[PDB]
Scaffold this active site. Structure first.
Site, PDB file in Angstrom:
ATOM      1  N   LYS C 186       0.867  -1.161   0.000  1.00 51.47           N
ATOM      2  CA  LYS C 186       0.000   0.000   0.000  1.00 51.47           C
ATOM      3  C   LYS C 186       0.905   1.211   0.000  1.00 51.47           C
ATOM      4  O   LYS C 186       1.385   1.622   1.053  1.00 51.47           O
ATOM      5  CB  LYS C 186      -0.969  -0.012   1.187  1.00 51.47           C
ATOM      6  CG  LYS C 186      -2.000   1.119   1.157  1.00 51.47           C
ATOM      7  CD  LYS C 186      -1.808   2.086   2.320  1.00 51.47           C
ATOM      8  CE  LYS C 186      -2.454   3.417   2.092  1.00 51.47           C
ATOM      9  NZ  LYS C 186      -1.541   4.432   1.505  1.00 51.47           N
ATOM     10  N   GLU C 262       9.164   0.795  11.295  1.00 48.73           N
ATOM     11  CA  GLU C 262      10.230   1.784  11.171  1.00 48.73           C
ATOM     12  C   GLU C 262       9.556   3.136  11.335  1.00 48.73           C
ATOM     13  O   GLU C 262       8.829   3.583  10.454  1.00 48.73           O
ATOM     14  CB  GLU C 262      10.876   1.688   9.793  1.00 48.73           C
ATOM     15  CG  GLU C 262      11.640   0.392   9.502  1.00 48.73           C
ATOM     16  CD  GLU C 262      13.077   0.394  10.007  1.00 48.73           C
ATOM     17  OE1 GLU C 262      13.590   1.479  10.368  1.00 48.73           O
ATOM     18  OE2 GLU C 262      13.698  -0.696  10.031  1.00 48.73           O
ATOM     19  N   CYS C 296      12.960  10.372   8.819  1.00 48.10           N
ATOM     20  CA  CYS C 296      12.749   9.839  10.166  1.00 48.10           C
ATOM     21  C   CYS C 296      14.014   9.995  11.049  1.00 48.10           C
ATOM     22  O   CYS C 296      13.900  10.198  12.272  1.00 48.10           O
ATOM     23  CB  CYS C 296      12.251   8.382  10.097  1.00 48.10           C
ATOM     24  SG  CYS C 296      10.655   8.114   9.226  1.00 48.10           S
ATOM     25  N   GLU C 393       8.696  15.474  16.820  1.00 49.30           N
ATOM     26  CA  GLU C 393       9.202  15.376  15.451  1.00 49.30           C
ATOM     27  C   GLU C 393       8.505  16.428  14.568  1.00 49.30           C
ATOM     28  O   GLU C 393       7.280  16.429  14.432  1.00 49.30           O
ATOM     29  CB  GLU C 393       9.009  13.960  14.898  1.00 49.30           C
ATOM     30  CG  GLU C 393       9.479  13.772  13.464  1.00 49.30           C
ATOM     31  CD  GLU C 393       9.482  12.315  13.052  1.00 49.30           C
ATOM     32  OE1 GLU C 393       8.404  11.678  13.102  1.00 49.30           O
ATOM     33  OE2 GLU C 393      10.558  11.817  12.676  1.00 49.30           O
TER      34      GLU C 393
END
Ligand SMILES: C[C@@H](Sc1nc2c(cnn2C)c(=O)n1-c1ccc(CO)cc1)c1ccccc1
Ligand SMILES: C[C@@H](Sc1nc2c(cnn2C)c(=O)n1-c1ccc(CO)cc1)c1ccccc1
Ligand SMILES: [Cl-]
Ligand SMILES: [Cl-]
Ligand SMILES: [Cl-]
Ligand SMILES: [Cl-]
Ligand SMILES: [Yb+3]
Ligand SMILES: [Yb+3]
Ligand SMILES: [Yb+3]
Ligand SMILES: [Yb+3]
Lengths: 494, 494, 494, 494
Positions: C186, C262, C296, C393
């Site tokens: 996806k 992750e 990330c 973040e």
């Protein structure tokens, strides 16, 4: 699908290959290369001697120096170069198989469909290992950080036989290059040609100069120069157990260079009464007769349980009588010649002992043709253990069939040899398959098959059939040298 | 805590150990064993020769037969036996260290605190590997199930030196037994005694008979018998590079037995200008002077950058002048004797070359005492590369200190030797530590330390300092023989 | 060399890819795909929902059945297919990089030179593992033969983010396919296009149908369908830690499917006073600003020792003021847009907290342009730990620089987060480099560099930055399921 | 040899174990512990709740801090502590087996000869791994030195079931401690006692405080506290698949803690017509009936080929009629009670469905005795797939025997379950053994045996029978967290 070459093959590469350039010999001598099927000279090739091996080692040493392109390139890029070489060998498959067939006396269908397929697949397998060779981090006692480097060893001298010239070339150079070594290759005096074509493809692929050097010539000169050289770090050799002993001795005398050896065999098959009989006959047959018997794994002692022994011998003899001898290039031909006179003589001499020492000749047992080193496919039944044909490697199309009734005793007989390259077990019984294969003193044990070789498996000999393993994960260890680095630190933590 | 033995040591075990029983020699001869500190005879020991090695191999072969207790016991139980042996060595630590000190000329504090601690720890480490030796299942091409067995090789001949008799015994037998091999051990002629006590403990621990056999005697007789034997599968040897070459040659001539060698060195240290100077002096000092210089890893060439060279030499000389020579059993004594006359002579002869060839004698350079093979601790500065003391392994308490200004050149000089056992790098610079240790052609590279050995690390030589590795995970591979089993199946699935 | 596409790109593949054929959605709905630089609609794509994921799983399940082409083909052939896919991606490098740049808001130089190079290299790396995935043979207690199979797990649901669409696609499918799994992918709702082109290349390469199925659409529908499916064996997800928690929860509720994640980070750098200052500034800069901060691993907390802090901030600010904003396709442009409104808003809102909570704005801190989700590159100095910009973040071009004087305390501060994806250490001191990297609770620790990613290394998070590892040897374990086979035998031998 | 305890057992340890000291519960509540054979209260034990788990985690966290004794000790010393713990468990074998029998309802012969032997052997196996956990050095692209650390994860929450309390305790703590983790253990509410005795031995052995913490109590309180804790890094759970789903969900909701699960099964056996019939009957019998059926691997569906089905059922029924029920402490008694009322009720309710849904009751099918949770050993033949007794885990002494004629179909039926812990195949045919075991979706497949468990093998479930593996080399990976360290260097060399 067996395609063929449309033009007659021309030989182009006949020179010594050092630093990606073509060299005449230091002496200036050349030596003839023959076709074993016609006994005709194909060409001449530059004769490498000690003086040439010296040039080749100096180039390999320079290509291995810290800071060189080969030492500093990404491992992934060593891999890339190897996969490129495989693509080029695939491109030149027709040319290479034809040259391999013509120079090696090797049936073309097999050369094209098996030898070249195995060459390409083995190279691609080795390419994949290049950036997956890893050391360790180790929880040593005390306040230290310890790691290991699995470095390339250095300059590897690699001596190749005549029976599978391309496959043996790639079995040597693939792992050695994947691990970061540089190499000096000495192809067989009988079969230098396909290796010299591969050298042209190593140049084309873009390997740095001096990473692969190929020195054609004879064994007692160029091969001895390699084994006794003071600046070769490792020798790898495939061939006779006799020469294997000279190689290991010379390594000892000179510079204690690392040694791996893939040597001969007298490989046994044990066929139990419950075996699929046709399958056992077919695999034992091809097991001994493949490539005119010129395989180190030749299934040259077939022990069959007494109650199926007669039927086994009958079916085997009928299978051996189906061959069509001739030039290995003609379609429909199913058996080519032996490689040369030396081998041819040894084969016939051993066939004569079988007769004289009292084995039952079922078929064959003499030569064939007006030209070419051809031997009739031969079957001996009622062979016993003290016969020469049961003790010595024939390396010819000569099958030995023995009877047994005791499994304890036939395992002793199977193991009662200085050889130990391979063995075969044929049974439907799970327990027998596991226990017999565990008890056999053989490097590869096939169960309900024979001569199944693949790049993913390690391959090599127990006892005087070899030292070390080639291919598989395990084979890659013998192309690395392990360095432990131990660093003082203030305090370690797990 | 340095405890000691309360009664004077008695020697009990002086016979050849085969099938867990004590044997007189076939000839009936015995040979004397000496204390190097007093030159006095300690006892006599049965002299093993070829005829005795033959008995020992036959017992090892029988203990290795398929179906034997050693082949059929659980791997976990091989482990258990090894951990039991370690417990017994721990129990007899005082006795063993005393015997080791008295027979080996080895300082007792070191014998007790280091040698015996390392013996026990190495055995416990190897015990843990026994049931963790594993083969593979391999996704071979075609419809086959392929697996490998990492079998024991078989009867392993193991030749032990005199410098670390117990540690070297356990470095041999620990991995060999963990992997399932049987062994024939030949301890050094100078130091048979501690090994014969360990044999009594192998019996007590309950190892099946014939799994460990110990044959004391001389090298040119019992050692040659081992290296040339037609039914020993592998020889492992630690000692001189000279004898190493004879071992490898003899293996080649006889039965192509597998060979590992841990040989001498001329190991270099590179001390950069930014190094912690005291730390570099202390480790380089102990690096060359440990156990009267009788270590294969002896840091026998110390290259120091010019701007810190004078200060390095000064501090090193002061450290070398702090020793107290004497009987290794007396507390406070910090330097024992050399092992024997042969070594003693070689050391003094090499000390004389340093003087004659023009090295600067800073201290020492002669003998000490009325009895015992004692050499004064010696330091030479301004050593150059063509000197005998810079090329030859001294194996005595003799330090060489050199100057350098170019890092490129000092790495060439460090690598410019046929040896390659180990090396040392002293710097605070991350990049220098990594790049220099990568460029050194040495099996172990210590960074800001020296002589840090542990069971968890592989250990061995580049070049003529050795073949193969001992200990660590990697060292265990050389006590296995790999068998590939390939089984025909109707259809494989991933 | 930065070559470019000569014709304007046309979008061809916009449909759901199942069983190597193109499908309309079950509903028949489609959803728009935008260019983040222009805010303009590029095209529409078929909207996959639960009903479509169901078709995709059924096809993956059928392709995984025992006896299927994918289960029965040689592992080496799985490898071959993967290397072929890499060749096709290399062929279409210009097209793919352009589509990646245009759809992803990704600078074209980086798309072409880094993203596509990494895609090709990662695929080639994974191809090499295919026939090197191996189980074990194990010396179990008792009379048994035990081996293990490292089988593929089965149908793996793989959810890909928008920040590196091609790289993330290959990081998922490469290892999963190498190990023999089938997949339902996806791709991100923002960036479906490059994955659909890769699907066309999977067909062209000759992967059996159903081995790779790609279902574009939204996360709360198609992504939830995957995570909650009763016949998906494993879900792999890269994205926000928030969504990561929903994935793991849903796996728990449904069928206990295996999970790897992750996730995000708040990755710290520690810059010691002895660091190469320019190198630390350059790597910390690119460490936080790469791909408009949408990594990330973003180095979003840079702790600098006080004595070099002012100079560090000054040099960093000058480097941040050198950017040229614009369409990522124009040469010379050095900063593209953020991916979309949701992210853009979150970034600006967090920039406002830095101002309000009292951080020092050095440069930037607002939007740019009349069109496109552009944010000025922003630097805050004097950031403290309780600030939102130090805890959350940002995923935008916003750098935080902090001061420290105590190494003990700055390691606590570095570790004082629920994140733990990566970290950076800058020093010349060997001991500091080793001890600090050991003490950091981070999956990857870079020393004197940052953002160095390669296929040969495992990559993943400590703590809430992830579960498991991708790539390297270690990452391949999480795409296998281990089966132990234990066979009764009459008698085992070692 | 079955020795016994000479004095009646006294219970000593009944408190929560944190930082090597005994704690009352924070609430001050205690809970009763019962003997399942008498229904009598043995004692009371301190009831751990969330508040106590919090104390235990804080202690585990402190014991895991960088610089702590547990983080800084040699790996070899972690090993030593574990082998010492095994020695102490061996010393207390009689006491532990008696307590295990009395508290667990477990036959004493089995407790002493199997459970305690397995505990000791598993601990010794894990001890051996401690200093053999290693990372890698990796040839990354570019000029970098990359290595990995396989660190301990941290604080591991470990929830243990009641069916094998000691074995399950050691299966958890052995690998977790070997790898360097600290643990918070929650033994089963039914069986806290043997774990609390082991805690006393952990103290005696000299483990640093806080490395092992044991918190007895209930599952919905203390177990939920563990699974939802924000500072536990990993949860390991053995038990029902139902609770397994709650554990995985809670890990997702809280802090994304790592999860391994060893859950229930409905494990099938396939008995082919060519099987050794008596061997298949004996192993299938013990396969389902071991420890009153309270094994997750219970062989609870036995598919037998039609031509041997009647004879199989007859022989199985005769074997099931040989049991002697009673107190598990009395010699000659061969079946103890079920653990508690909850299980007892579930078993009887499922036995009633077999009758009602139309299975053929061959023997048993009701309760036994005036006291104790005893169920008659029960056999159902003519079971079909939609029956409750063929779909649901009974966890009682209840055997299901089915017929089949098609091998394709019986493999589908075997695999047609959400479970997948284990399976059995009985045949003499080599090809059938390999192909059937490959096709079964089960974590362990036994061939011609059942319930052969050993420390050297990995063990765990496919599908909803588990996530991850325990023991073997492979199981140790899930107690490590991998850190990649990538260091910039001037120039790399291979
Ligand atoms: C060409 C084969 S090797 C091969 N195939 C055979 C032998 C006898 N019958 N067949 C069919 C046979 O002996 N070989 C073979 C050649 C060389 C070596 C090692 O020196 C080992 C074996 C191959 C090479 C590479 C990969 C896969 C297969
Ligand atoms: C006793 C040491 S080995 C040891 N320690 C030393 C040497 C020089 N200085 N120090 C302190 C030194 O040379 N060794 C040593 C002895 C034998 C071998 C292999 O043949 C390698 C090294 C040890 C043995 C086993 C485990 C751990 C340590
Ligand atoms: Cl290693
Ligand atoms: Cl292997
Ligand atoms: Cl495994
Ligand atoms: Cl790793
Ligand atoms: Yb002729
Ligand atoms: Yb004298
Ligand atoms: Yb706008
Ligand atoms: Yb009752």
């Amino acid at each position: 699908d067996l395609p063929v070459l449309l033009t007659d093959l021309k030989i182009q590469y006949t020179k010594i290959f050092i630093n990606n350039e073509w060299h005449d010999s230091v002496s200036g001598k050349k030596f003839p290369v023959f076709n074993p099927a016609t006994e005709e000279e194909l060409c001449q090739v530059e004769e490498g001697d000690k003086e040439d091996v010296d040039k080749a080692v100096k180039a390999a040493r320079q290509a291995f120096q810290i800071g060189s392109p080969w030492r500093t390139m990404d491992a992934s890029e060593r891999g890339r170069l190897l996969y490129k070489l495989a693509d080029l060998i695939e491109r030149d498959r027709l040319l290479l198989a034809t040259m391999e067939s013509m120079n090696g006396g090797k049936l073309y269908s097999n050369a094209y469909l098996s030898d070249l397929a195995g060459c390409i697949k083995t190279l691609r397998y080795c390419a994949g290992w290049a950036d997956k060779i890893q050391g360790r981090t180790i929880p040593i006692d005390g306040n230290f950080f310890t790691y290991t480097r699995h470095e390339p060893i250095g300059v590897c001298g690699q001596i190749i036989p005549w029976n599978f010239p391309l496959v043996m070339l790639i079995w040597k150079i693939g792992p050695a290059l994947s691990c970061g070594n540089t190499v000096v290759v000495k192809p067989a005096e009988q079969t230098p040609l396909t290796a010299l074509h591969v050298a042209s493809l190593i140049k084309e692929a873009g390997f740095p100069p001096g990473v692969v050097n190929i020195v054609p010539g004879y064994g007692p000169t160029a091969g001895a120069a390699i084994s006794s050289h003071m600046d070769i770090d490792k020798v790898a050799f495939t061939g006779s157990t006799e020469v294997g002993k000279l190689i290991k001795e010379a390594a000892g005398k000179s510079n204690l260079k690392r040694v791996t050896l893939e040597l001969g065999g007298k490989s046994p098959c044990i066929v139990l009464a419950d075996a699929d009989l046709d399958n056992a006959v077919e695999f034992a047959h091809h097991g001994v007769f493949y490539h005119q018997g010129q395989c180190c794994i030749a299934a040259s002692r077939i022990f069959v349980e007494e109650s199926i022994y007669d039927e086994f011998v009958r079916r085997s003899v009928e299978r051996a009588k189906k061959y069509i001898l001739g030039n290995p290039l003609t379609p429909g031909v199913t058996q080519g010649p032996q490689i040369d006179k030396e081998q041819y003589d040894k084969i016939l001499d051993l066939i004569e002992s079988g007769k004289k020492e009292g084995a039952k000749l079922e078929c064959g047992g003499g030569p064939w043709g007006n030209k070419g080193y051809f031997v009739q496919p031969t079957v001996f039944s009622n062979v016993t253990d003290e016969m020469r044909i049961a003790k010595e490697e024939i390396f010819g199309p000569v099958q030995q069939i023995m009877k047994f009734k005791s499994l304890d005793d036939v395992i002793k007989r199977a193991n009662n040899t200085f050889y130990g390259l391979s063995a075969g077990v044929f049974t439907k019984d799970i327990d027998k398959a596991i226990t017999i294969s565990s008890a056999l003193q053989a490097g590869t044990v096939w169960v309900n098959c024979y001569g199944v070789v693949s790049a993913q498996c390690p391959f090599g000999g127990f006892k005087m059939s070899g030292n070390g393993r080639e291919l598989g994960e395990y084979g890659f260890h013998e192309y690395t040298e392990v360095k432990t680095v131990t660093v003082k630190i203030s305090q370690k933590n797990s």
